[PDB]
Design a protein around this ligand. Structure first.
Ligand SMILES: Nc1nc2c(ncn2[C@@H]2O[C@H](COP(=O)(O)OP(=O)(O)OP(=O)(O)O)[C@@H](O)[C@H]2O)c(=O)[nH]1
Ligand SMILES: [Mg+2]
Ligand SMILES: [Mg+2]
Ligand SMILES: [Mg+2]
Ligand SMILES: [Mg+2]
Ligand SMILES: [Mg+2]
Ligand SMILES: [Mg+2]
Ligand SMILES: [Mg+2]
Ligand SMILES: [Mg+2]
Ligand SMILES: [Mg+2]
Ligand SMILES: [Mg+2]
Ligand SMILES: [Mg+2]
Ligand SMILES: [Mg+2]
Ligand SMILES: [Mg+2]
Ligand SMILES: [Mg+2]
Ligand SMILES: [Mg+2]
Ligand SMILES: [Mg+2]
Ligand SMILES: [Mg+2]
Ligand SMILES: [Mg+2]
Lengths: 45, 191, 189, 41, 176, 139, 117, 97, 26
RNA sequence: CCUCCGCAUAAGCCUGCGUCAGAUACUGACAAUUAACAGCCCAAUAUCUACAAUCAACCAACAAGUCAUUAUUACCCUCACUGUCAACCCAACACAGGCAUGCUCAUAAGGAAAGGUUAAAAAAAGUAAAAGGAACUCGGCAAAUCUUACCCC
RNA sequence: GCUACCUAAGAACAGCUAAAAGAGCACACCCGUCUAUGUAGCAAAAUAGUGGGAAGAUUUAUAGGUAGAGGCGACAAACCUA
RNA sequence: GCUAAACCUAGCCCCAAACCCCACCUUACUACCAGACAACCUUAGCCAAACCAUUUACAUAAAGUAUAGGCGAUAGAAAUUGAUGGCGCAAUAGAUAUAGUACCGCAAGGGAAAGAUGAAAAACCAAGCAUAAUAUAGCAAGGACUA
């Protein structure tokens, strides 16, 4: 019954975890900064 | 090349080299003393003498130089024997294969004295840089086509058609080819 | 590939001495060396042959590589690996003498030797499989030596076997030669 | 790992030698051989 | 014609095709702008032919005859481009004094990193461009801590590299 | 041209001209049956079909009747020893139909060792009668 | 769910796939009814020269002298182009010698560059 | 099996290199030099523990006091946490009280 | 690898003893 | 013999049973999906736009409803770009699960329940059963039939 | 991106009885009454049968919104990425 | 005799010194249209006080002194004084790091493993088993015994 909570959709993906949304708020800017400091190959989604 | 790549007898880009050093090898690096480019004194074709190992004393001709590992390969000297073309049935043919020698194990030979010599990179007024033997002086010299349908003749290649001018290639070509443009480029904003 | 393989021998004999004019080749040899003697060669060739076969007896590959060429060493050692050979030269019936000489540049000398030798080849387990350790046998052979013309020397290159050569000594063990391993569809002919 | 034990082989053998004539894993596994050897002594 | 995309029919199938030397920058510098303009298309046609040969060789699972001439042609085209760029740069410096052909400016991005923002071409001024105004070219105070952290990460990496180099040098000296 | 900023065009401005073309194309053998008048090219991704038409008509004087393009996706499934996907580059494929009834067919391109061969000829494989006894000895 | 793969026009719904491109420079605009108006002036015009009689083959003969590399500089260009006229008119208003006060009014403006390649 | 099967490469120690040969020299600089220099001034090392000794908590406190402002951000955070933990351990835990 | 020499030396002696036992000399 | 299906679009995925060669629905190489279908639109300033849909005709309504321009000024002179493959997606899996829409309403399309043997117990699913017919059981649970009447909430 | 509720603009509901019905039988579809199996399972809640609704307070695709001292809730202390 | 065993250097730790072409904020990595929207505002709590509620640390010497403090747990000055590498690690260690990669999660985020020939490749030892299943009786051993 459970397990399939991920119903993929690129519109939702980019509108929820995209670069633009991450930069929209100061908190998301700090999220991107944390990813950069850690060296993540994927800063945003 | 991958970090700490182990230079071998095979060239760094051959099939045998790729077989011996796949991308995932992490062998211990080889410790090689840092001989500067201005201190390297062994060159391809130089006559040398072997100081250590089998064939010690014999003098040969340097065929290959692996600088990254301070290696000189003396042609037909310091040879072991290996089979080439050995298949499931045929034993193959024995071939003499040279083994690399270190520049500390190999010394240059005087052009005429035919004896091992110590070398210095003494400057000369004419030969700005050239090898000079120390124990007996004398300079050791450094050893060592038809145009196709798609090759420029020498005179055409060296012809100086360039007349310097305050014109860009674009406008010069426009004048040469006769393209006439009257429209004025409207100014744009940069930011 | 700037570097190339530096061979120390040739693939095979230049001109085969068909067993029962070469002064140009002798001249070339002398102009390359300046101290060679055709008349004195046979003794040196015999010494080289005896030493090479004693090296085979003692499994001295290092000395073999100096006494025989790279076209000779595999032929001598491949089939004798993992077995012991008790070879011994007892005497030379008639004196050895040069026969034919021909010539980056190699020179080949054919020497006819009619000598007397002994053989005893044992298995991995020390079981005799060829010859007698003591009985001597008369052997007529044509050894072709070769030399490379700075640090080269005279080394055995080949052995020419006459088509009229007497059959070699028979083997101790019996042999089975399978016939055509026919597939089911195939039929014997 | 400034200081590490390098004699553990011999420390184990000092007991396994007395445990060699036992049955089962008591003659091979130190965790068992030590108990069996202590009981034997 | 399409035949210009392939080598000479006589050369077809040849194991090796002899080729001259790649054009050198000094040699090209002596040629006029029109001459360089024509040589550019000569080399472009040769490059197209050689790329066609390479792709067909890959398709046929065979080595490309004389692969070095493709590198020679690429080097010649690069040298011609460099010569033309040098002439254009010299003229631009003489006439305007600008060392860059494209306008740009050193700006601090939203992450506090100093970048060279290369200006784009627009029809309306920046104060009216909506998207440009959405783009932010300033770092707020909360970015200072991350700037310090990145600086310290870089310093740690550099210190590790230098210490390792000194260790290796000492090992080499002891060995020799 | 590619990897260059195009001068922005405003109404009534001058024609956009490129003097030293940066596009390099490949003429490739079609992988499937094609009409006699169709030629297949591999093109830089930044080249439009209009650009290809002008390119062929100016540099090669090839009369082009029609051009179609498609972006072939290169496989990203392959993985290296580090389990990182190796990306085969995507490339643009252009199908060009020649004009004036002209026909094109891809040309049929591609229409020490001595010592090794000599020794192989001189193998002298072992005789079964010998029963493994070495053949060098003449006794 | 794939973050390490490049974002291309082949990924996403119909709107995303239609909207994203592959780097090809624009040729015109869109009007009512999605009709595309292509502007000729926006199409790059390949200025291909006449190669007839051209003597420069793609490759150079190996029997050619080697010369030291001397990258062209502003000073060298000035010396080779303007200096002679300056000397002549000094022995005997820089626009006469060639200086252009402003790039505006030129078809090929050096800065900001407004021409291809 | 945690024992190597081959002897390790011989370890040769030059007992008469310069460092060992001149070790201890100028340790009596004070008493033999009119006390111009204290022997602790011969100590080369971290600035916060030159001629000074203490337990881990004291060493951490001294490090923070003397070079805390020059420490990296995460290193200083780690030092603060270590000082906190050492304070708690030394002032609230132990057999003796 | 564990730094040290004496344990390795002892193990070498034990290996020599085992080798002798397995292949006693004439 | 089965057919829940199936074929497309959407969404998702991203080359994931095409060819060649090596191995032992894998690996490497080669090839491929071609726009008309779909996405990617619209020059301004004002000014218009009461009267559902339901075969829209009678009727009946209530919950009161997806579907419209004009006036002047501008403006044509020049068909790009992107998706197009697959045995596919979300469920750690070649997962008996989840999965929108258009047709097909049993198929023209798509598939195989049995690796071979034997035919023990116990276990699961099903079928048949003398006479009896709830005597079972907490209870007619299950199964079989199609079955009345009275209460509590 | 599940789920609770909501916003925008969409889609689906065979056949029969009745007749403008939060009507009846009954598909698709939604749900999950009871039994059996399963219980490291096909499944971290399924399968087979059986059953409730199935023109509505229905179901459902897309995008958006409400965030933890909170949200949302036909209150089950429900649901808010097992 | 198979699984396997080992190995030495990849690097790292602590100090000193020293200050450090094009594309991309729209669905990032997207050539090319009227914006207007802009940042600052006490840390808290765990925990200790054996609960918890005020409270509870974040060069040397003066000095744990003056003081503060449910005057108790604890907190705590100032005046004043004068100020060149490694008895480090060596692949379960040392950085998480071969890498913030693979993989996992919608996301924030979490986060691995491992390699060893030689100058040149253009040359005997853990467990587990097998050799070799088993003989009445039993913490499997001890005393023993010819066994
Ligand atoms: N304590 C310590 N001394 C170091 C360190 N790095 C270098 N040194 C010392 O620096 C001195 C000079 O180092 P060298 O490499 O010989 O010379 P250099 O490159 O001129 O030195 P620097 O100026 O320090 O970079 C020697 O005494 C080294 O021991 C380090 O990390 N710690
Ligand atoms: Mg959903
Ligand atoms: Mg298309
Ligand atoms: Mg089956
Ligand atoms: Mg079965
Ligand atoms: Mg009955
Ligand atoms: Mg009853
Ligand atoms: Mg009844
Ligand atoms: Mg009863
Ligand atoms: Mg029932
Ligand atoms: Mg109905
Ligand atoms: Mg109803
Ligand atoms: Mg309640
Ligand atoms: Mg309750
Ligand atoms: Mg408390
Ligand atoms: Mg307590
Ligand atoms: Mg003070
Ligand atoms: Mg580690
Ligand atoms: Mg064992």
């Amino acid at each position: 019954a459970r397990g399939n909570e991920y119903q993929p959709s690129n519109i939702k993906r980019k509108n929820k975890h995209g670069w633009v949304r991450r930069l929209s708020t100061p908190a998301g800017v700090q999220v991107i900064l944390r990813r950069m400091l850690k060296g993540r190959k994927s800063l945003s989604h | 090349l991958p970090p700490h790549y182990r230079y071998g007898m095979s060239p760094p880009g051959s099939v045998a080299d790729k077989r011996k050093n796949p991308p995932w090898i992490r062998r211990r690096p080889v410790v090689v003393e840092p001989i500067s480019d201005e201190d390297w004194y062994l060159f391809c074709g130089d006559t040398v003498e072997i100081l250590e190992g089998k064939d010690a004393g014999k003098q040969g001709k340097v065929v290959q130089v692996i600088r990254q590992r301070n290696w000189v390969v003396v042609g037909g000297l310091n040879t072991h024997y290996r089979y080439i073309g050995k298949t499931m049935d045929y034993r193959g043919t024995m071939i003499p294969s040279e083994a690399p020698l270190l520049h500390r194990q190999v010394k240059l030979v005087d052009p005429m004295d035919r004896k091992p010599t110590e070398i210095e990179w003494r400057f000369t007024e004419a030969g700005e840089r050239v090898r000079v033997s120390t124990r007996s002086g004398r300079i050791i010299p450094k050893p060592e086509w038809i145009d196709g349908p798609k090759d420029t003749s020498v005179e055409d290649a060296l012809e100086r058609t360039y007349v310097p001018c305050l014109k860009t290639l674009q406008e010069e070509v426009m004048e040469a080819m006769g393209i006439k443009e009257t429209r004025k480029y409207k100014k744009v904003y940069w930011y | 590939s700037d570097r190339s393989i530096h061979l120390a021998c040739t693939a095979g004999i230049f001109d085969a001495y068909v067993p029962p004019a070469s002064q140009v080749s002798i001249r070339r040899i002398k102009d390359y060396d300046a101290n060679f003697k055709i008349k004195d060669f046979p003794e040196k060739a015999k010494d080289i042959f005896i030493e090479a076969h004693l090296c085979l007896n003692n499994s001295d590959h290092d000395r073999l590589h100096t006494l025989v060429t790279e076209h000779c060493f595999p032929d001598m050692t491949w089939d004798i690996k993992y077995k012991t050979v008790r070879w011994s030269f007892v005497e030379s019936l008639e004196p050895s003498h040069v026969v034919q000489v021909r010539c980056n540049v190699y020179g080949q000398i054919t020497v006819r030797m009619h000598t007397r030798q002994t053989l005893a080849i044992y298995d991995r387990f020390g079981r005799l499989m060829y010859g007698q350790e003591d009985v001597p046998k008369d052997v007529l052979e044509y050894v072709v030596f070769e030399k490379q013309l700075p640090y080269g020397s005279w080394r055995m290159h080949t052995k020419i076997v006459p088509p009229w050569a007497p059959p070699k000594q028979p083997i101790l063990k019996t042999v089975m030669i399978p016939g055509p391993q026919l597939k089911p569809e195939e039929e014997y002919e | 790992l400034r200081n590490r034990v390098t004699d553990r082989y011999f420390r184990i053998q000092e007991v396994l030698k007395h445990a060699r004539h036992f049955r089962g894993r008591k003659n091979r596994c130190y965790r068992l051989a030590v108990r069996t050897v202590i009981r034997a002594f | 014609g399409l035949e210009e995309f392939f080598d000479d029919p006589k050369n077809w199938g040849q194991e090796k095709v002899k080729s001259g030397a790649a054009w050198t920058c000094q040699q090209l510098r002596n040629k006029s702008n029109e001459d360089l303009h024509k040589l550019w298309y000569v080399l472009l046609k040769e490059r197209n032919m050689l790329l066609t040969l390479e792709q067909e060789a890959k398709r046929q699972r065979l080595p490309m005859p004389s692969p070095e001439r493709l590198d020679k042609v690429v080097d010649s085209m690069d040298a011609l481009d460099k010569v033309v760029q040098e002439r254009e740069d010299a003229l631009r410096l003489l006439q305007t004094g600008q060392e860059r052909a494209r306008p740009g400016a050193w700006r601090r991005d939203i992450f506090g990193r100093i970048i060279w923002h290369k200006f784009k071409q627009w029809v309306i001024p920046w104060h009216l461009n909506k998207r440009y105004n959405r783009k932010r070219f300033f770092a707020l105070p909360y970015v200072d801590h991350f700037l310090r952290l990145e600086r310290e990460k870089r310093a740690r990496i550099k210190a590790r590299k230098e210490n390792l180099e000194r260790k290796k040098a000492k090992i080499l000296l002891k060995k020799f | 041209a590619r990897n260059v900023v195009y001068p922005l065009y405003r109404l009534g401005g001058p024609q956009l001209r490129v003097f030293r073309t940066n596009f390099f194309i490949q003429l490739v053998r079609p992988g499937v049956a094609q009409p006699e008048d169709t030629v297949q090219f591999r093109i830089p991704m930044e080249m439009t079909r209009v650009d290809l038409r002008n390119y062929l008509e100016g540099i090669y004087n090839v009369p082009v009747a029609a051009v179609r393009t498609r972006v072939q996706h290169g496989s990203n499934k392959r993985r290296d020893h580090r389990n990182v996907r190796i990306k085969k580059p995507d490339y643009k494929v252009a199908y060009v139909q020649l004009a004036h009834g002209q026909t094109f067919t891809f040309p049929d391109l591609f229409p020490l060792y001595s010592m090794l061969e000599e020794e192989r000829q001189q193998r002298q494989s072992s005789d079964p009668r010998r029963g493994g006894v070495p053949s060098w000895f003449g006794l | 769910a794939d973050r390490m793969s490049k974002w291309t026009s082949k990924r996403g719904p119909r709107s995303f796939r239609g909207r994203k491109g592959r780097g090809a420079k624009g040729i015109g605009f869109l009007t009512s009814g999605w009709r595309f108006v292509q502007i000729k002036e926006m199409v790059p015009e390949f200025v291909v020269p006449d190669l007839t009689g051209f003597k420069l083959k793609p490759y150079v003969s190996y029997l050619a002298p080697e010369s030291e590399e001397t990258p062209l500089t502003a000073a060298q260009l000035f010396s080779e182009a303007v200096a002679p006229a300056i000397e002549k008119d000094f022995k005997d208003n820089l626009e006469k010698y060639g200086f252009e006060p402003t790039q505006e009014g030129k078809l090929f403006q050096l800065y900001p560059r407004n021409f291809l390649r | 099996i945690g024992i190597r099967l081959t002897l390790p490469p011989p370890k040769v120690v030059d007992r008469w290199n310069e460092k060992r040969a001149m070790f201890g020299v100028y340790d009596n600089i004070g008493i033999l030099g009119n006390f111009e220099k204290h022997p602790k001034e011969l100590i080369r090392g971290p600035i916060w523990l030159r001629g000074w000794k203490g337990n881990e908590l004291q060493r951490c406190i001294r490090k923070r006091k003397m070079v805390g402002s020059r420490m990296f951000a995460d290193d200083l955070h780690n030092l603060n946490k270590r000082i906190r933990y050492l304070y708690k351990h030394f002032n609230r835990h132990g057999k003796f009280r | 690898v564990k730094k040290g020499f004496r344990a390795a030396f002892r193990f070498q002696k034990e290996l020599e003893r085992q080798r002798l036992l397995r292949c006693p000399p004439p």
